[PDB]
Amino acid sequence: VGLTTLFWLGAIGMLVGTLAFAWAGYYVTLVGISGIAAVAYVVMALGVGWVPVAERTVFAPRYIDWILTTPLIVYFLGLLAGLDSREFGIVITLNTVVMLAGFAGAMVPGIERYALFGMGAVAFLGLVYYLVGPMTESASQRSSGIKSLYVRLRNLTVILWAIYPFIWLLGPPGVALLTPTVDVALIVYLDLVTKVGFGFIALDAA
Ligand SMILES: *C/C=C(C)/C=C/C=C(C)/C=C/C1=C(C)CCCC1(C)C
Ligand SMILES: [Cl-]
Q1: Where are the Cytoplasmic topological domains?
Q2: Ligand 1 pocket, residue 124 CB under 6 Å
C-alpha cells in the first residue's frame, strides 16, 4: 500500500460525496467542502505538491485544502446555529489562524515550527470554546430538530478535529515518530469522516 494508493482512495471518497451532495441539492457548501478536497487528493495522488523540507516530505495541497474547506465547515455550523454576521467573523478568523499556523509550521525546517504549532493550538482552543459555548447558546433559539442536528455535527466536529494536532505532532511534521504511510492513512480517514461523513449526517436529517 503506497502513498499514491491512499491519495487515490481519498480522491474517490471525496468524489462520491461530492456527487451525492450535488444530487441531493447548505447543499452548495457541502459540494465545496468535498469538491475542493477531491481536487487536492487527485493532485497529491499524481505526485504534485510533495515538497521536501529538511528530512521530511510535506504535502502542500493538503494545507490549501484545509484552509479553504475548514471555514466552510464552520460556516455550515454557523448557519445551523443562526449566527449574526459578526460572530461568523470571529470563528472564521480563529479557524484561519489554526490552518495558517499549521501550514507555516509544516514548511519551516527548524524548531521554530513548534512555536507555530503552539500558536495554532492556542487558537484552536478558542475555536472550541465558541463551538461549545456561544454557538450552542445561539443554536438553542432554533427548532428542536435544528438544535439536535447542530449538536450532533458539533460533537462530531469537536472530537475529530481535536485528533488532527496529535496526528500532525506524532507524524513527519513533528517528532517524525509515525511513518508517512501510517500518518497519511490516518488523515485520509479523518478527512473523509469530517467532510463526507459530516455531509451524510446532514442529508439524513434533511
Ligand atoms: C477537512 C479537513 C479537516 C476537518 C481538517 C482539520 C484539521 C485540523 C483541526 C488541524 C488542526 C491543527 C492544530 C489544532 C494545530 C496546528 C496543526 C493543525 C493544523 C494540524
Ligand atoms: Cl503535511
Answers
A1: 82-84, 140-143
A2: yes
Span between the terminal Cα atoms of the chain, in Å: 37
User: 52: which DSSP letter?
Assistant: E
C-alpha cell at 52: 521536501
Q: What is the 3-state secondary structure (H, E, C) of 114-153?
A: HHHHHHHHHHHHHHHHHHHCHHHHHHCCCCHHHHHHHHHH
Q: Contact at 8 Å (CB) between 158 and 129? A: no
Q: Which of 98, 113, 178 to mutate for ligand 1's pocket (most ligand atoms within 8 Å of CB)?
A: 98
Q: Which ligand is nearest to the CA of 169?
A: 1
Q: What contacts 99, CB < 8 A, 6 or more positions away?
A: 63, 66, 67, 70, 120
Residue nearest atom 17 of ligand 1, based on CA coordinates: 102
